[PDB]
């Protein structure tokens with residue numbers, strides 16, 4: 381455990397600018413399912429994992445299955461299962477994602493297969509990217525049944541109600557975003573059998589689902605490891621044990637702050 | 652076939668770059684390619700075959716040091732793969748090399764995703780190790796920097812000269828009217844409101860191509876990029892279309908040399924209940 385050095389220069393207002401809600405609905409070959417709601421600069425705030433109850437964080441409203449945004453997700457779970465069942469003929473994850481300006485809700489929808497975009501729709505242009513064989517023996521006509529996704533009437537009927545709720549949620553997220561309350565770790569001695577080489581681990585634990593970018597730099601800054609949040613953030617750098625000192629870790633948030641940790645001579649001595 | 656050559660560039664201008672791509676699969680399939688910065692591969696080898704190239708170029712000579720550098724990397728990647736990769740997938744090592752000044756960049760890709768890189772001063776690992784390796788980042792870093800480019804630097808100017816001539820022959824070979832273009836419906840035989848319009852282009856010129864098939868309203872499109880099947884160039888795109896709106900579906904092909912080819916599904920072409 382290590383104490384953060386908080387560089388706040390380049391701080392942004394996460395609740396500033398136009399509001400955007402991101403609805404992500406995924407399915408794998410196993411039958412694993414996910415439904416998530418995020419904001420523009422956040423990871424998942426409300427989620428449902430393999431058909432469980434809507435889950436969230438202790439700094440926000442309890443997640444309610446009767447909320448019109450979650451009813452939207454549940455309808456999509458159904459849609460994606462039917463979708464998955466005709467089209468998908470090789471194993472892999474299918475992701476349908478709505479990017480929704482609020483209070484309209486003229487949404488963009490992206491379809492990803494194994495992380496790649498196979499289709500999209502901005503309500504003006506439908507796009508199919510030509511890679512079908514990769515994941516199906518069915519043709520573009522089948523695919524185009526699903527391209528537009530589901531109607532968003534549930535969202536637009538309650539458009540304003542949804543807005544004031546997620547403005548409230550973002551405001552709670554901003555209040556919870558306290559960099560000094562996250563937990564920070566700088567572990568060495570991960571290669572116990574290697575006499576000359578070691579791995580330096582940097583980890584952060586948080587209950588705030590902002591996007592995080594973690595870089596572990598070597599002493600000379602000629603070697604780095606990069607991780608992104610997925611809520612644990614962890615990254616691992618191979619290092620020479622005689623150059624473990626001054627190896628740093630830098631973490632930047634989606635709210636604009638930057639934490640740096642340093643492997644000090646205090647920590648070298650105790651090792 | 653409606654060719655537009657406004658904006659055509661000189662693909663052999665600016666500083667030259669050679670791109671060396673070397674791949675291995677779990678089943679032991681392999682690929683080694685050389686391309687310029689604005690092309691797909693010009694020389695390639697597939698599953699250990701002899702170098703293959705195009706009708707317009709020098710016969711691919713296996714004794715060329717650039718090609719020896721590819722075979723040398725075949726050995727590197729086999730060793731790399733054996734002790735790093737513990738789950739099925741394609742590993743690609745890619746050198747981006749300025750010529751004649753061979754201060755190269757190297758990228759590593761697993762399943763199409765970048766896992767490691769070394770540019771000038773800085774080695775980068777992206778921490779996704781525990782998805783392709785049971786082993787540790789200290790194993791990886793044995794391979795990050797790749798091979799010494801000594802085969803390339805020893806022969807720097809000869810390579811520059813050879814590839815300057817290959818680039819000119821390619822630039823000369825790039826002749827849109829000598830490519831083969833097809834625009835075709837009647838793919839969906841048992842469909843009442845729907846058809847598929849297929850746009851295809853066959854070429855011996857390994858430029859990068861971007862293909863869009865547009866509906867009559869420019870409100871629906873299919874996009875295909877030229878894919879490189881090892882000295883084999885596929886550009887094919889398929890657009891689902893309402894049969895009643897098939898007229899004026901247009902296909903639009905753009906090359907990395909700057910030209911665009913439009914193919915329109917014309918009134919004349921609709922006249923056909925064959």
Ligand SMILES: *[C@@H]1O[C@H](CO)[C@@H](O[C@@H]2O[C@H](CO)[C@@H](O[C@@H]3O[C@H](CO)[C@@H](O)[C@H](O)[C@@H]3O)[C@H](O)[C@H]2NC(C)=O)[C@H](O)[C@H]1NC(C)=O
Pocket residue numbers: 398481484486487488502503
């Ligand atoms: C969803 O609806 C919003 C509006 O409610 C659309 O946003 C608007 O998009 C237009 C066209 O891109 C923007 O107009 C542009 O404005 C810039 C800056 O002033 C100007 O220089 C450009 O020439 C252009 O006219 C407009 O700013 C923007 N409005 C707002 C309030 O954001 C959006 O495009 C819709 N999205 C979808 C997926 O349909």
Ligand SMILES: *[C@@H]1O[C@H](CO)[C@@H](O[C@@H]2O[C@H](CO)[C@@H](O)[C@H](O)[C@H]2NC(C)=O)[C@H](O)[C@H]1NC(C)=O
Pocket residue numbers: 898899
């Ligand atoms: C389909 O596209 C063709 C080609 O653009 C259209 O033909 C044009 O029609 C206008 C009006 O008569 C003329 O000004 C152009 O000179 C024509 N172009 C050519 C090349 O013949 C045609 O109008 C379109 N068809 C439909 C049904 O809209």
Ligand SMILES: *[C@H]1O[C@H](CO)[C@@H](O)[C@H](O)[C@H]1NC(C)=O
Pocket residue numbers: 749752754755756770771
């Ligand atoms: C190496 O070549 C020269 C050195 O001055 C420079 O222009 C270039 O940025 C370098 N290239 C890379 C990618 O290492």
